[model samples]
Target: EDFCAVCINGGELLCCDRCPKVYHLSCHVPALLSFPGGEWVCTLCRSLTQPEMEYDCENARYGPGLSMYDQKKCEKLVLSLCCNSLSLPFHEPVSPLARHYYQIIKRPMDLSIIRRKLQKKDPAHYTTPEEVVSDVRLMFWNCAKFNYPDSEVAEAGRCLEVFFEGWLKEIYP
Candidate 1:
């Protein structure tokens, strides 16, 4: 029996952000920090799709020892942070937040429109990374609210500071 792809069938699974294929976190490159929420592309899927070829957004913030030259990593990091922010713990299995976030990400939001808005915006307009994370966080946060108004997510602001701390530590420290 093969351990690579077969492992995905039983162990803790990390579903690709854009597709339904499930894989083990260890099956990925750097392993995943709790199987993110905002966006994730499996190695197979990433290879299949072309990257954003030319994005030299003036607003993008590159930290020390970093630049927009590595745009894919930067985008992946931010999107992963957004994913972390929304991915609730699935200690026993999938939690409400996990399922809700999955449903949201699975929505038919136009990829072209998202790309257009991303390139058009000034990353500098975001005074802080928290704002950017928050913005991404809100995209799915709003999804749950529209349907589950009385749910815990309606008070989404309460759960973000911890995620921000973790997010900042990963990129800055």
Candidate 2:
């Protein structure tokens, strides 16, 4: 089909080198790097190597690198989380004004930053779904650690985490 498989819109579609699928340059996962000049293989056509050790989750086995399938799924997952109203506080890094925030959370993470990483097509980008999961967990863990369990902020964090996990199950399952 000539239309984008993702957005279902019809202009300037990048046809897959190996399949009949088409997509908007940006709609594709690991998004097209600056509009390709030559033949561009769609994500599904690209073969990905597996990690040395398998990452076993409750009902899923993840590799160290994003599979052609998981790449797109993970992107969708992150985007949905970013759009959640409850995600406002977790959109960016915790404010520097919050004293002891940095002292307690050694590695801080947030939805916007995660989305940025997902948009890239390099090593710096998320290579595996496990990595994405870890960052998300880190974001929530930071919230829990920085705020008291009874705090409203912590409750919001929990709510988002529950939503995230529920959606994630669909991807992995």
Candidate 3:
């Protein structure tokens, strides 16, 4: 009677145990690996189970708001907010979206710090990983605070939600 939440298809879709929603394993981010032992819960089904947090936009070691690969995401998100590419609300203000605006993005010669940081936000709790939830919310809040534009706010929010959700499944599932 139900279909995939993503493509509205049927068959082979992994169903959520807690809720009626199902998903195509190939459609999941970071992708799913192996059947989760118990009732596998979907991201949306576990959202409100945790708490959100705040960040210091003025300082954080990386300078402000964004940091590390998170900064990398900003580069991508920044591209999405371009004037020519984002041609929806013609009545609203248009910001210059550049394609040649290539971010140099010099990878750290070490890569160790980056790896370690990647392993850093691995849920500080067993219930819903409060830090994980907070971090996702803070990511967008800071992006907008830095004047990233609200043209794609919902899209941006969902992007982060899905990305961090890969981790959120650890506690939620």
The TM-score leader among the candidates is: 2
Record all residue pairs in model 2 with backbone atoms less than 3 Å apart, i.e. clashing: 66-127
Sort all candidates by TM-score, best to worst. Answer: 2, 3, 1
lDDT by residue (tens digit), candidate 1, 20-75? 55656643433344546456665334531365222223333222222333334434
Q: Which ten residues in a row have the lowest lDDT in candidate 3?
A: 105-114
TM-score of each: 0.30, 0.61, 0.30
Quote the positional error of residue 4 for candidate 3 in Å.
Answer: 4.5
* TM-score, prediction 2: 0.61
lDDT of 3 by residue, 27-97 (tens): 32213545455556554443332412112211232231234334323222221221112212211222335
Candidate 1, pairs of clashing residues: 37-83, 38-83, 59-123, 59-124
Displacement of residue 17 (Cα, Å) in model 2 is 26
lDDT for residue 167 in candidate 3, whole number 0-100:
45
User: What lDDT tens digits, residue by residue, belong to model 2 across residues 120-144?
Assistant: 4434777878889999998998898
| lDDT value, candidate 3, whole model | 0.36
Candidate 1 local lDDT, residue 53: 26
**Residues forming the 10-long window of minimal summed lDDT in candidate 1:** 108-117
